[PDB]
Amino acid sequence: GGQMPIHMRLPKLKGFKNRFRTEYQVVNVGDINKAFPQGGTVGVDELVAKGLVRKNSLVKVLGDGKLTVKVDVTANKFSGSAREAITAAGGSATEL
């Protein structure tokens, strides 16, 4: 109507974008537990086979659920909780 519009009378959101950001596709230990009842080696290939992460992305594993199986996980990155939860069930958190 003529007054200063809502998008012009408020401050712009602070910050910048950092185009060199490394973004990861994340998978939780609960999903791994559900999808791998028999355990076994777990890499990015089978993580995309069971439809858990995108095809050709970077995978980081997060420790949300509960892990109760012996599993040998390989991934780009691991969180502290996920690594501890994998190790406690007698598995190896191999980092690429």
Binding site: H7, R9, P11, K12, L13
Partner: peptide
């Protein structure tokens, strides 16, 4: 997309639209 609106407003994890407050520059 409107450039000023994009620069002024963001969304949260559930869909809440979020802004900043004035009278601070």
């Amino acid at each position: 997309t409107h450039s000023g609106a994009s620069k002024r407003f963001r969304r949260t994890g559930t869909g809440k639209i979020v802004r900043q407050k004035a009278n601070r520059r």
